[PDB]
Amino acid sequence: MASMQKLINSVQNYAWGSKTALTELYGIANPQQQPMAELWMGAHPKSSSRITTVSLRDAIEKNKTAMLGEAVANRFGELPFLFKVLCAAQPLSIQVHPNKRNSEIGFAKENAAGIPMDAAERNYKDPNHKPELVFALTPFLAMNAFREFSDIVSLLQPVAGAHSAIAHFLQVPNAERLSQLFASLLNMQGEEKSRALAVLKAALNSQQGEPWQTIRVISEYYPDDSGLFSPLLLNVVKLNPGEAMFLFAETPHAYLQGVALEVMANSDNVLRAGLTPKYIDIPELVANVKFEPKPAGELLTAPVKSGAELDFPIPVDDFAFSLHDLALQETSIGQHSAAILFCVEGEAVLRKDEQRLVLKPGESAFIGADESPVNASGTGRLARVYNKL
């Protein structure tokens, strides 16, 4: 193993992935025009990155302290982050990540039931909650958290007659009635559901702009989904490149279009909340959602610039994320932990003593804790996932 290891990374060819994005952005080969949904950078047991070839997982397993650093070897016992490029060419499902206590419970329920971790029925893979950070690489359309009540009221007007639960909320717009509204919409069946959707679709022809536009787009993929009402309840966000959001527990969100970097745990817990053909346990979902608005001005995470470094402070010990402006003069990039460095744009030259490693856009390198620091020079920006402990 050299000081700096250029990663060979997995691309997950999920059907919702873009056939072109990784190629357009990074020159990643795709002669067969497969959907390319996620590019994984990390040591996940199902699909670890490789180094020159051996599994990064396997390499770390053989000297955790040297590779991870003492702090991470102590606190986590494994690489504590998975770093992805996500390319959403179709709108994805609305999801909720349960809080710590409910995660402990769900994890235990599933273990007690003997559900394999890998089963498609398995919803809880960690007895904990860790936030997730999403950072836009191209303009990125998403939903995140409930709108202020007055916003929801205004948006539900044109569809007040779609369902009695909508009328009920409008009569007294509060958290309790929002919860009831959310549950009622998800539980609509048969003609009740079709009538509600008919009202909404008629509205889509007499309302202009957002979120009505987002509903139109989603309806091309989920034309019979009660989740079509969701943009009226949840904030629709359009991230410009370089903007980011942190997904809090107990909060519905959805990735709808575009390319983003995602920093997340290796193992997470997901409850679905719409835009899915799958079964939803509504009582469980509702018991794990906080029906409280989040103001639009609070949706983006505010980064902090210090010299050439832009940190995105994350309220969790597990992982940290920064962007580094490259210059032709070297700057030192150092950390107490394993790091993954990813060239966002431009070109990065990494140097450790006499070793040099060039990263073109879309390429990444793993730096073991023992090998910090490395000097970076070039043009553009380098993204870093690491651990601050």
Swiss-Prot record:
Molecular functions per Gene Ontology: mannose-6-phosphate isomerase activity; zinc ion binding
InterPro entries: Man6P_Isoase-1, Mannose-6-P_Isomerase, MPI_cupin_dom, Pmannose_isomerase-type1_CS, PMI_typeI_cat, PMI_typeI_hel, RmlC-like_jellyroll, RmlC_Cupin_sf
Cofactor: Zn(2+)
Protein name from the UniProt record: Mannose-6-phosphate isomerase
NCBIfam families the record matches: manA, PRK15131.1
Positions with a binding annotation for Zn(2+): Q95, H97, E132, H253
GO cellular component, one term: cytosol
EC id: 5.3.1.8
Organism this protein belongs to: Salmonella typhimurium (strain LT2 / SGSC1412 / ATCC 700720)
